[PDB]
Amino acid sequence: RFHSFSFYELKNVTNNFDERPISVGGNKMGEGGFGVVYKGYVNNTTVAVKKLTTEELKQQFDQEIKVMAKCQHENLVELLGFSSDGDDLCLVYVYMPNGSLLDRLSCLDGTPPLSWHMRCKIAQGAANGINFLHENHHIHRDIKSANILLDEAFTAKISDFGLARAIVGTTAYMAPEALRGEITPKSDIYSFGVVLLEIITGLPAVDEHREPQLLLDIKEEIEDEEKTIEDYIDKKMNDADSTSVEAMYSVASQCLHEKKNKRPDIKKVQQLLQEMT
Template sequence: MDKSLTSATYIRNISYRLRRQLSDFLDPQDTWKEVIVSIRKRNGEPRYSQHHVRRFEGLVAQGRSPTVELLNDWGTSNSTVGELVDILKSNKLLAAADLLLPNTTVEEVTSPETLQISSAETHSALPTRLLEERELPPPPPPPPVSCNLQPQIPQEDTEPGHTGELELTSFLYSELKRITGDFDDRSTSNGGSRLGEGGFGTVYKGFLDNRPVAVKKLNPMDDMPMDTLQVQFYQEIQTLTVLKHENLVDMVGFSTDEQQLCLVYAFMANGSVLDRLACLEGSPPLSWQQRCLIAEGAARGLEYLHCNHHIHRDVKSANILLDENLVAKISDFGLTRASANQTSTTMMTERVVGTCAYMAPEALRGEITPKSDVFSFGVVLLEILSGLPPSDENREPQFLMDVRYDIDDEDEALTLEDFMDKKMRGWHLSHATNIYSLACNCLHDRKNRRPVMKQVLSEIRGVVKSVSLESDV
């Protein structure tokens, strides 16, 4: 039992560890079905139909827990632990109920009258979509032994990072308004708070106890209704609660009150790689050594994600942020998926997501695989080499990923040396050739011909070591 749990705790705030313990009670003999048929909407109608039940049954063949997935889905509403315990006890599932709230009688949790009132008052204004209408965010994986490395003991070929539940702060929306100057839409350079556009929302700068933070206010769009946005909101929280690494952005907390979804992160003083390569707001060009270190850091972050069986699905230079020391941090995890069975297998989805200029051929077909992240990272490497944006309507070819065909074509005049960023100093053609060859390998049309992120990281490290040795001479 989590001592912080009360009958008023939202189901979505039940830890993954406790969800797995509940699944030990409810998965055998399909006991979870007794729970799902008891879950009701505000009007008293069943929340889930037999069609939904069959969909949950299908998860078993994928090695996934129907109980965990049910709690993930039900948790997108404002349903509480008290409501869940009432259902468990009404179905004589006392051991499971006691796991959540030991020694609590049904009357102590919620009376029928209280349940009716609380259900009407706290029902989310962000409704839960039916299961067949959207993807369920998968549960985070248990920490694999081989990847659960200790940050305080740096070793050769190991990555600092760990998995495990982290405590995040739940902010009042009014507090976030206060620290961002009421979400002042003027840019920070003009005295406002607006830092720019992030994934599915606008990012503002604020201060918590004199510490700068970035507040992302999520906004529904024509192609992103509020309920879908809510799923991605909780997916990002879920991912960054479970996974922690030097090269992943640090989440401070979140806010869900007043029907507003906000995420709070540590402030990244140097913005995104996309903006720094463009020398936005007069920032100086990145040197070759800085770019190599940024590439290495981003590769480390992605390798850590893949090592922990997560696929980012939207790798791009705009989602690689830089702190005050130009340390690369992967951000925007709203589209992230955990691999089925905690393996690096391919999954399928009917909803194709991502950014077109970075998308692998299989991603356009709805395949979800770590090799798609590798492909997208190949585009990022080309950006680092050239300083060019990933897409430009006035450029031929429009997509940067296609420029490699001109470089590799002996009948074309474009060479790698011509392709390199003219603003960059300190680069050597031999090192640049290594990174370019790696990028081309990452961009192979056939995913099985691409390297895995561990190989990508190893090759970049080799270049970084060579560059460091030469700079010391």
């Protein structure tokens, strides 16, 4: 816990950082978070190799390793190693066979839709991961469905601690105070509220070809009685029940309070999600 890898070992296990997608015979799994993620192999383990303002990127790399060293939990991704050249930076993680929550909600690459039952477990798991971070006095600063990874049993794993500490983030998930420059765990709660709406609706947080463009704005439509939560429930499920959907929506609505001090803390969010099932 944890090794340094030679840049050449990682280059060799990712077929020379083969930028072609897995489907074509390459090693590229994705791109985001200032990098490209490649599928690699270390003896009995499939791994994810993330190949990464010059000095600011190195600070993000060092920060992530620091967070990983301190924060070990069932609902946080596990770092296996790192490389560091030179001007070549790699982070090696336990491979998550089910990718991100974002991609599973959109059924990317033809994966079947997540059941309401699975969605409830993922929401609980993600809240448990955030609770571990907040209990250990860390603010994530980039809570989003792309940063919630899914293992072999669809267990939620909080990812990307590159921005974490004691104006950056993703605009569609950011709390008003975060957009103004404030750093608070209360902003993580707001972002988790957007994730909960993505879980209920199966809709992305932002869509330029949609009315409203921002998913968080459906809260206003529902409050003003222009729409109902029933109207927005992801139709790609057969096992959703109005009671538990309304209970998850009530949590999301509380998380999305415009006034940071009126939002529940992560312990309250966990309690509410536990009561839901």
